[PDB]
């Protein structure tokens, strides 16, 4: 039939794509990076412990000044932290307590918040009335909202397998990104804010162009769902954490995998992934209550941050690169260094 | 507090007021019962919610107790990616229709509907997030049951069943079949109830079961249990 002919043609085209990908591979990153000086061992002490949340913390985002923090917890609260003096600047109550993501505007003016309510609320921190009020509620997703990132433009991902670029001034989706066959779990925004990447439970990560709304590339290789994703600081590499206890480093230019970071002693999935300021270290929060810190340019492990009493839910490194925040289901954030 | 500026002291005072407000809010939110309502298609949840867009929250008040009912029927997604958000609920209200003998799935007519609900019950009772949350098992539409059983033998669903084809004897068999799926017999307790469409004691049964769960939890965290 016509359908069968199209399916076999697509299979042949995928075979051609695979052959093209494997024809450009000469040496793994671990063979070119075999003569460099190893990092060794990295020790980080808990400089700050941020307490005040009365439930599991699911979201956390760093401000662009590397001082202010925002964190979202299931007790219906969005708290903004000084993170130097441990002071609380704002405490925002949510209409829906089932929050699973939050974002901080790069200008420090707005905060985004979403969850199982299918709605992305946007709050204005700097008003003349002295209170934080809902500037705009964005609706149109039919599945749970998993990630949101500011670009008056915000890009969100949902559990309905579609992403959406919005316009906060109007309130309607200016672009809709489709092509994922499973729930989209994580978003990552390039340092140039022109190409973003979303990973899905399809065990695939897609690279989308914001201006055209067209999927540039698709990366596969995981054997389970993708929970966290990030860019290399120069915006030319991936960092995906999946449920099969492996992290992976995909390359945009080569359209190919470079490194897999895994160890036998780890059997649980990765919940959060982040790099360091220079991209030499790769942090990764795990289900077994701790946060490993891998050497990213090589493949070896470097350190462990095991000062948490529950699953590490969210992770983040400052823009300056001085500190690392880490949230968990035990309701405490910890600033390391 | 000796090297702080005046604005630093004022900021610390503001933070302390924020903590006071957060503590009061969290104390007010810990005195209210949270029940997660599950079920299958056309099981009878519509009658259950009347007799007492993402998540559908429902408020209720009985005696001096407040209840928050979290209907999750309208959210079609991957369940294992958001079900742990409901870890810590007081109880799981699972509604099953007893009229699922001659009824079959529209997508697959060859598959029975009762087994389809048993699969969901097994998946949610044996889940790794609800190893200590009690289940209130409601069995709805017992008026259609007592008239369907006389013309359609129950043996169609259960080839291994052997007993009298009456209501009072088949109800016990179906209750035992549903209750046997619990592999944690010591941490979880199932409170089965047989209800009709026009019964007004469902909310009292829910109140009794949740008071029992509260008593057991208080005995557990005090060390006596």
């Amino acid at each position: 039939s016509e359908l069968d002919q199209l399916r076999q043609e697509a299979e042949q085209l995928k075979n051609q794509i695979r052959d093209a990908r494997k024809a450009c591979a000469d040496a793994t990153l671990s063979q070119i990076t075999n003569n460099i000086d190893p990092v060794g061992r990295i020790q980080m002490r808990t400089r700050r412990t941020l307490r005040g949340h009365l439930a599991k913390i699911y979201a956390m985002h760093w401000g662009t000044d590397s001082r202010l923090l925002v964190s979202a917890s299931q007790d219906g609260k969005l708290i903004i932290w000084d993170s130097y003096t441990t002071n609380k600047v704002h405490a925002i109550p949510l209409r829906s307590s089932w929050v699973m993501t939050c974002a901080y505007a790069p200008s420090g003016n707005y905060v985004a918040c979403g969850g199982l309510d299918n709605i992305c609320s946007i709050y204005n921190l700097k008003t003349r009335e002295g209170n934080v009020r809902v500037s705009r509620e964005l609706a149109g997703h039919t599945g749970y909202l998993s990630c949101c990132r500011f670009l008056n433009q915000i890009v969100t991902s949902s559990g309905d397998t579609t992403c959406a670029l919005w316009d906060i001034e109007t309130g309607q989706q200016t672009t809709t990104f489709t092509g994922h066959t499973g729930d989209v779990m994580s978003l990552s925004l390039a340092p140039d804010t022109r190409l973003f990447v979303s990973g899905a439970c399809d065990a695939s990560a897609k690279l989308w162009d914001v201006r055209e709304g067209m999927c540039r590339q698709t990366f596969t290789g995981h054997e389970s769902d993708i929970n966290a994703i990030c860019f290399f600081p120069n915006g030319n590499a991936f960092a995906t954490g999946s449920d099969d206890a492996t992290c992976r480093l995909f390359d945009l230019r080569a359209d190919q995998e470079l490194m897999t970071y895994s160890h036998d002693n780890i059997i649980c999935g990765i919940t959060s992934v982040s790099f360091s300021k220079s991209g030499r270290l790769l942090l990764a929060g795990y289900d077994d209550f701790n946060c490993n810190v891998w050497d990213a340019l090589k493949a070896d492990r470097a350190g462990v941050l095991a000062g948490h009493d529950n699953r590490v839910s969210c992770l983040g490194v400052t823009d300056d690169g001085m500190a690392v925040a880490t949230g968990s289901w035990d309701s405490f954030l910890k600033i390391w260094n | 507090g000796c090297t702080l500026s005046a604005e630093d002291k004022a900021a610390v005072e503001r933070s302390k007021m924020i903590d006071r407000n957060l503590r009061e809010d969290g104390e007010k939110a810990a005195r209210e019962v949270k029940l997660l309502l599950l079920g299958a298609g056309e099981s009878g949840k519509s009658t259950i919610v009347k007799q007492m867009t993402g998540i559908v929250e429902t408020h209720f008040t009985f005696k001096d107790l407040h209840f928050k009912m979290f209907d999750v029927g309208g959210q079609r997604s991957e369940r294992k990616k958001w079900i742990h958000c409901f870890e810590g609920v007081t109880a799981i209200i699972f509604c099953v229709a007893l009229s699922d003998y001659d009824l079959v799935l529209a997508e697959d007519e060859e598959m029975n509907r009762m087994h389809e609900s048993m699969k969901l019950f097994d998946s949610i009772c044996n889940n790794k997030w609800f190893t200590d949350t009690s289940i209130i098992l409601f069995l709805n539409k017992k008026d259609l049951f007592e008239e369907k059983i006389k013309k359609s033998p129950l043996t169609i669903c259960y080839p291994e069943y052997a007993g009298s084809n009456t209501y009072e004897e088949a109800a016990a068999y179906i209750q035992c079949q549903f209750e046997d799926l619990n592999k944690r017999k010591d941490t979880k307790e199932i409170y089965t109830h047989f209800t009709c469409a026009t019964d007004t004691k469902n909310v009292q049964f829910v109140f009794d079961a949740v008071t029992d769960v509260i008593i057991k939890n208080n005995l557990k965290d005090c060390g006596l249990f």
Partner: single-chain antibody, 228 residues
């Protein structure tokens, strides 16, 4: 946002009075409040301060024991009860809202004034008048007794502006940050104990008196000010 004041008028010496400020248009329960007067000598003088949750009250050393400041949140009011009004208490009392967290402007909005006629770091400011025709840049200088730069990096200097027939308004907070709605023509700079305010293009809306104030510690002291 609005603060409307009442309770003034002529009072015989030795008596007592009460000044009431009503807030309309903002979350009054989360704002600390100040009472700041101004004698006919054109010198602003901080009088009293009450915290956001009424958990902290400060007074100027001159008025302690005679002035009581108290806020009421449900009806959004601020009261100053004045007892034994001496002849040096003739002024025009202003009420100022103030908010303190990381990155805020603690003196943005001022009240409108209540006439009342009865029958420490020192701030030395440059001069009393700077006659400059519009079109050219104007520089004003201000000096303190000791350094205002704290160990945390902040220098607590505030530059205000009072137009003829109006209440003051915030121009610059912490010596370098420009207030909201203030054009970028004004800018502030300096270091240690010496501070300057420069206006690149003076226009007809910059005429008035300028004041430099410190917020390093209480009491808060205002500069004499320079007329433009």
């Amino acid at each position: 946002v609005q603060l409307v004041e009442s309770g003034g008028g002529l009072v015989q010496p030795g008596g007592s009075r009460k000044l009431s400020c009503s807030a309309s248009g903002f979350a009054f329960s989360s704002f600390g409040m100040h009472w700041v007067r101004q004698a006919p000598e054109k010198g602003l003088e901080w009088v009293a301060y009450i915290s956001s949750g009424s958990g902290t009250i400060y007074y100027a050393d001159t008025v302690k024991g005679r002035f009581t400041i108290s806020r009421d949140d449900p009806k959004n009011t601020l009261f100053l009860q004045m007892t034994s009004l001496r002849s040096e208490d003739t002024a025009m009392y202003y009420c100022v809202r103030s908010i303190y967290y990381y990155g805020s402007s603690p003196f943005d909005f001022w009240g409108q004034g209540t006439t009342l006629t009865v029958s420490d770091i020192v701030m030395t400011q440059a001069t009393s008048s700077v006659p400059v025709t519009p079109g050219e840049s104007v520089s004003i200088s201000c000096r303190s007794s000791k350094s205002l730069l704290h160990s945390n990096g902040n220098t607590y200097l505030y530059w205000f502006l009072q137009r003829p027939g109006q209440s003051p308004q915030l121009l610059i907070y912490r010596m370098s940050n420009l207030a909201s709605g203030v054009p970028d023509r004004f800018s502030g700079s300096g270091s240690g104990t010496a501070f300057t305010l420069t206006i690149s293009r003076l226009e007809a809306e910059d005429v008035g008196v300028y004041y430099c104030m410190q917020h390093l510690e209480y009491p808060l002291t205002f500069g004499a000010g320079t007329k433009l």
